């Protein structure tokens, strides 16, 4: 189906001594493929998926140079923002940035994004037109004027619509064996008595990819939300994801209840019953 490339950057100031902690991660869809950590020994961009390892020295030298440049920009920004907000040199603050591109099934450009946060709140973001800026407050408005004058959106648009998509396509090809494979959820139901006349039914979806999934309960063919619990989708640790949904039912009435599983890896949704 559709695909995306996304980079996430976090810089955290360390007022007591030294420079900010800087961490960058890159993803294709729900697969991490590179990382940089200022605390790590290599001081280089590092591979985190087999299909990126085939890239040669010029690639790794270039990604390292760029990620260090990103880190210096964020380091300077921490000082600038402290000033904008009249904050003390005493406290730790955070800059976050995320950017990337989406393509459709035809691998053509669909959407781009580039957004920036200070202390966990929206600061400035490129609009979907890739021309305009959303500034959350008056400090961000100062940045917006600066970025208008420096043609920033033009450069960002060029990267998002061109370079970003070109390299996404390259990665999708090189990592096709996994990146273009869907792993359907392996599903089962468990039963846990909560008294001698009521029980929890838990509907499990395991080892699936991508992370997107929907789990729903029905009773007698109609949606059931009362007495249900749905946990947030969580990583298994091997590149796949997990989720469960549960419902409390009167014992003996289990057959009324059906769990419904929707996932891109399933041609048709699955229905599970206790039995």
């Amino acid at each position: 189906g559709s695909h995306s490339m996304r980079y996430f950057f976090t810089s955290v100031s360390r007022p007591g001594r030294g420079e900010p902690r800087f961490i960058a991660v890159g993803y294709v869809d729900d697969t991490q493929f590179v990382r940089f950590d200022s605390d790590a020994a290599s001081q280089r961009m590092e591979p985190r998926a087999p299909w990126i390892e085939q890239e040669g020295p010029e690639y790794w030298d270039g990604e390292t140079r760029k990620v260090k440049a990103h880190s210096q920009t964020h380091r300077v920004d921490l000082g600038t923002l402290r000033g904008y907000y009249n904050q003390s040199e005493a406290g730790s603050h955070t800059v976050q940035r995320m950017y990337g591109c989406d393509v459709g099934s035809d691998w053509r450009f669909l959407r781009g994004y580039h957004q920036y946060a200070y202390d966990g709140k929206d600061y400035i973001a490129l609009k979907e037109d890739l021309r305009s800026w959303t500034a959350a407050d008056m400090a961000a408005q100062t940045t917006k004027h600066k970025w208008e004058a420096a043609h920033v959106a033009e450069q960002l648009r060029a990267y998002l619509e061109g370079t970003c998509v070109e390299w996404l396509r390259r990665y999708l090809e090189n990592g096709k064996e996994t990146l273009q494979r869907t792993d359907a959820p392996k599903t089962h139901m468990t039963h846990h008595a909560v008294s001698d006349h009521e029980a929890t039914l838990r509907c499990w979806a395991l080892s699936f990819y991508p992370a997107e999934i929907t789990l729903t309960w029905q009773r007698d063919g109609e949606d059931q939300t009362q007495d249900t619990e749905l946990v947030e989708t969580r990583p298994a640790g091997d590149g796949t994801f997990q989720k469960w949904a549960a419902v409390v039912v009167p014992s003996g009435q289990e057959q009324r209840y059906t769990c419904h599983v929707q996932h891109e890896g399933l041609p048709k949704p699955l229905t599970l019953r206790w039995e």
Binding site: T73, Y116, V152, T163, E166
Partner: peptide, 10 residues
């Protein structure tokens, strides 16, 4: 592949 122009400060 990272953007090679992230140099405009806030």
């Amino acid at each position: 592949y990272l953007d090679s122009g992230i140099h405009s400060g806030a």
